Design a protein around this ligand. Structure first.
Ligand SMILES: Cc1cc(Nc2cc(N3CCN(C)CC3)nc(Sc3ccc(NC(=O)C4CC4)cc3)n2)[nH]n1
Ligand SMILES: [Cl-]
Ligand code: NA
Ligand code: NA
Length: 264
């Protein structure tokens, strides 16, 4: 149903400086439409198709939309709607802060909590929430992307395979310690994502030794409040980093808090 004919797309240039896979900007000739195209021998086919598959099952204004697949023969294609301003981390880092103000940061957070409220409702789990995995478009629209590790959950947790390796700065302690992933682990990451946004794209736990992060977190260390970050947003941010997953807010609560702030 989603399959398309590779001949349809014209591939113009490579897109990402090598950081996101083999992704090129594409022009769908017959529909006159700019699109992105992720392509894959690179023994990662199993996991590419898994990705192509999950994007068929989800649809939200703040999640990057699949337009079509070529997954009948190689090279395999993933054709998504094109976000002309790229990933959020570099956007924040390169933006004009007179244009991207505190209001715009709040808007970006609200839109992401929207995407995550929807996955939470769908009992899906993203597993790689971070500014580098969000994309920016016209009028400061932000959309969550990169669903390679995403899953529909059979119950309330998913256990990663032995020896899986994770981005530690974004990973919840129970995920580091017990390979346990849940919507509450996605909430932990969201918090770190909020800190990335608050700081216009700074690196979390700057200059800390990764092998000390768990240790520090268990002893209670958490990242300090960024300058300009409002107290309510910092309180919410800290809520996402509660040790016990149960004590963390839901994505519904979080989104309610930002929609309210976005008004007041
Ligand atoms: C998916 C997507 C990506 C985009 N747009 C862009 C745009 C972009 N830019 C490069 C630098 N200029 C200055 C800004 C635009 N760099 C990337 S880098 C990039 C490429 C691919 C993916 N992810 C996927 O293709 C998989 C999830 C389907 C993420 C980031 N993606 N539109 N839609
Ligand atoms: Cl790339
Ligand atoms: Na961590
Ligand atoms: Na905390």
């Amino acid at each position: 149903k989603w399959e398309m004919e590779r001949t349809d797309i014209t591939m113009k240039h490579k897109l990402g400086g090598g950081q996101y896979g083999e992704v090129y900007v594409g022009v769908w000739k017959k529909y006159s439409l700019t699109v992105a195209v992720k392509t894959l021998d690179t023994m990662e086919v199993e996991e590419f198709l898994k990705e192509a598959a999950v994007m068929k099952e989800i649809k939200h204004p703040n999640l990057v939309q699949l337009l079509g697949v070529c997954t009948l023969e190689p090279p395999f294609y993933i054709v998504t709607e094109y976000m002309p301003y790229g990933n959020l981390l570099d956007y924040l880092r390169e933006c004009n802060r007179e244009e991207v103000t505190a209001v715009v940061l709040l808007y970006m957070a609200t839109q992401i909590s929207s995407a995550m409220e929807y996955l939470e409702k769908k009992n899906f789990i993203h597993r790689d929430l971070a500014a580098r995995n969000c994309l920016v478009g016209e009028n400061h629209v932000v959309k969550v992307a990169d669903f390679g590790l995403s899953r529909l959950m059979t119950g309330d947790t998913y256990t990663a395979h032995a020896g899986a390796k994770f981005p530690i700065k974004w990973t919840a302690p129970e995920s580091l310690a017990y390979n346990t992933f849940s919507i509450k682990s996605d909430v932990w990451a969201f918090g770190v994502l909020l800190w990335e946004i608050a700081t216009y794209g700074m690196s979390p736990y700057p200059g800390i030794d990764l092998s000390q992060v768990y240790d520090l977190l268990e002893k209670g260390y958490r990242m300090e409040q960024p300058e300009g970050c409002p107290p309510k947003v910092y309180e919410l941010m800290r809520a996402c980093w509660k040790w016990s997953p149960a004590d963390r807010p839901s994505f519904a609560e979080t989104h309610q808090a930002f929609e309210t702030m976005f008004h007041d």
